[PDB]
Design a binder for this molecule. Structure first.
Ligand SMILES: Nc1nc2c(ncn2[C@@H]2O[C@H](COP(=O)(O)OP(=O)(O)OP(=O)(O)O)[C@@H](O)[C@H]2O)c(=O)[nH]1
Ligand SMILES: O=C(O)C(=O)CS(=O)(=O)O
Ligand SMILES: [Mn+2]
Ligand SMILES: [Mn+2]
Ligand SMILES: [Mn+2]
Ligand code: NA
Length: 612
């Protein structure tokens, strides 16, 4: 330097720029030059750092301590910033077609491309000076066990202490990650709440955000994620959806693996045999309930590897090995109860951050569907920081409110959940909310059929049934047609042991709007059937849509009131409509990039339905 504006050492309040690997230093200092933070804090991941940052947020009114529990905390947000926001989420590539298929007639629902030129303008209108008066925290983090051949490293720069705290839970972060990285590659993650000091606009609820300029961008060819204006969830905790789905799905395509919106569980039967399964359901369709299931069937055990994201790669032996790249659960709070998710209830009463839930007067948490009475006298403060009564029209918790809890605390966390080699997946499950037409469970006829089943996924949002292929509609890092081809190519991998593919529906309803299946821990009975089918058991009957359980194949003991005929009913009329809708969707949305085999599976299903 000819002056003193490029070396930021004097502003470092933890760590040392000299200690960092050369490329990490360049990333930090270049963005410090741009965003103009007051200080730079290089995170070490220590309990001391974590304790002190929580206390600082507490001092500032940014979080409250939940005194009923052990080291639990509550953040209430600006109501403008409450959710991952797909409408302001983009992927930048040279050519649009690499990001989304060019649709035949419509607008793509499979992604949102932005040109390099448009992104440069958007970036320049946002980031220069955006951290003025704030600390830039440098978060070194591993997605996956440290040392796993399947793990990847990120560096997230943020001006949000809430993001630091939450990333310590949801990733493996701190000094050991810098040491593991050395001069290797890493995903560059840049985040700002977009509220430089002095504040140009009012701060609502002590929650810094800039909704008008919110933009969550992914630049896969530059290995960069750049996020501005939201402090919330998937928009700010950049390891989770940004990295471990959007960027990682593209990396996966390049490198021969898969990055999916799937839980991973281990299930052990009464004969002491264990298998791992993965399942892809959309948001609001119960991955976290399944991943942590307390099975009702005697002698069965479920253990949780992860509840949301799976990274999977065939090894040299042909086994599909999966890791959970996360380090915690970022679970939807409302609807979580002792009956719907008793293992979550156990997990979240220590070392857990809650966002947008209600607070009880004794310092506890509350939400819709907690299904748990309060003692007379105990009152509730809503997520909008107002007194709230059970008879009020508004909910006490935001519908997308979340807990953020360490995975190591889960009482059924799988003993191999941090195994660097991953766990061998033997079945993959698809599913969504279908109130009509779709049976409780069916099994695909082939790998190709099963990829089609993933592709054809639909789920209830006046009710609207929308498409959500592979539970990845918000999350494809690249052209969905090419993603299909990538999944199909797995069948041609020498020695591959391709898992059995199933589709489930927990949500079928009778004519009165009542669920036909009780669900939750009773889903263990469906898992039992899958288990047997993986073992080769003669428990399946062929239908037009795939294999279903034979009469009397499901254990229905302790239920008895279940209407199996309606629950497993397959209507020609319904399935004719269904195939037409899938046809129209794939034709428009995937168009010139629809693989031959998926078109063939569509034709085959239409043909089988035609013979009913
Ligand atoms: N009827 C029924 N509902 C279920 C079952 N399992 C989960 N649910 C419902 O699914 C919702 C909870 O699922 P979420 O935690 O939002 O789903 P998720 O897949 O983990 O979502 P993300 O965390 O956003 O990826 C609640 O409405 C539950 O009542 C089931 O077996 N039967
Ligand atoms: O939306 C999902 O599927 C999530 O798991 C929440 S967030 O991480 O996108 O905020
Ligand atoms: Mn979940
Ligand atoms: Mn999710
Ligand atoms: Mn093929
Ligand atoms: Na707040």
């Amino acid at each position: 330097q000819l002056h003193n504006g490029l070396d930021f050492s004097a502003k470092v309040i933890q760590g040392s720029l000299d200690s960092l690997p050369q490329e990490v230093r360049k990333f930090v200092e270049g963005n410090a030059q741009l965003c103009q933070p007051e200080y730079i804090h290089i995170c070490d991941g220590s309990e001391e750092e974590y304790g002190r940052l929580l206390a600082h947020m507490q001092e500032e009114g940014v979080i409250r301590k939940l005194k009923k529990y052990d080291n639990c905390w509550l953040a209430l947000t600006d109501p403008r910033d409450v959710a991952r926001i797909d409408s302001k989420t983009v992927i930048i590539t040279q050519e649009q077609r690499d990001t989304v298929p060019i649709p035949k007639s419509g607008q793509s629902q499979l992604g949102r491309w932005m040109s390099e030129e448009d992104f440069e303008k958007a970036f320049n209108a946002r980031f220069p000076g955006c951290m003025k008066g704030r600390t830039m925290y440098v978060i070194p983090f591993s997605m996956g066990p440290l040392g796993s051949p399947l793990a990847k490293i990120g560096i997230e720069l943020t001006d949000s202490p809430y993001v630091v705290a939450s990333m310590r839970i949801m990733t493996r972060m701190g000094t050991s990650v810098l040491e593991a990285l050395g001069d290797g590659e890493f995903i560059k993650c840049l985040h700002s709440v977009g509220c430089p000091l002095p504040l140009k606009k009012p701060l609502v609820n002590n929650w810094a955000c800039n909704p008008e300029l919110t933009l969550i961008a992914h630049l896969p060819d530059r290995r960069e994620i750049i996020s501005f204006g939201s402090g919330y969830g998937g928009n700010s905790l950049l390891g989770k959806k940004c990295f471990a789905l959007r960027i990682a799905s593209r990396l996966a395509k390049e490198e021969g693996w898969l990055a999916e919106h799937m839980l991973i569980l281990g299930i052990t039967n009464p004969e002491g045999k264990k298998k791992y399964l993965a399942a892809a359901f959309p948001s609001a369709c119960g991955k976290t309930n399944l991943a942590m299931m307390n099975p009702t069937l005697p002698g069965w055990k479920v253990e949780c590897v992860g509840d949301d994201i799976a990274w999977m790669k065939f090894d040299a032996q042909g086994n599909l090995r999966a890791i959970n790249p996360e380090n915690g659960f970022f679970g939807v709070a409302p609807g979580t109860s002792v009956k719907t998710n008793p293992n979550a209830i156990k997990t979240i009463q220590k070392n857990t951050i809650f966002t947008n839930v209600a607070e009880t007067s004794d310092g506890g948490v509350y939400w819709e569907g907690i299904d748990e009475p309060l003692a007379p006298g105990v009152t509730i403060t809503s997520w909008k920081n107002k007194e709230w009564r059970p008879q009020d029209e508004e909910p006490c918790a935001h519908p997308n409110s979340r807990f953020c809890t360490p995975a190591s605390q889960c009482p059924i966390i799988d003993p191999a959940w941090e195994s660097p080699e991953g766990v061998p997946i033997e079945g993959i499950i698809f599913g969504g909310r279908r109130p009509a037409g779709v049976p409780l469970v069916y099994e695909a006829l082939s790998w190709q059929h099963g990829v089609f089943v993933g592709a054809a996924m639909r789920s209830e949002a006046g009710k609207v049934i929308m498409h959500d292929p592979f539970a990845m509609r918000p999350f494809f890092g690249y052209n969905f047609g090419k993603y299909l081809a990538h999944w199909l190519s797995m069948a041609h991998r020498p020695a591959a042991k391709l898992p059995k593919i199933f589709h489930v529906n927990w949500f079928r309803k009778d004519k009165n709007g009542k669920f036909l299946w009780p669900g939750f821990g009773e889903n263990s009975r469906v898992l039992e059937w899958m288990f047997g089918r993986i073992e080769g058991e003669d428990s399946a009957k062929l239908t037009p849509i795939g294999y279903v359980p034979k009469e009397d194949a499901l254990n229905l003991k302790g239920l008895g009131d279940v209407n199996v005929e309606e629950l497993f009913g397959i209507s020609k009329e319904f399935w004719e409509k269904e195939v037409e809708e899938i046809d129209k969707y794939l034709e428009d949305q995937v168009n010139a990039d629809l693989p031959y085999e998926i078109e063939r599976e569509l034709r085959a299903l239409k043909q089988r339905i035609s013979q009913m």
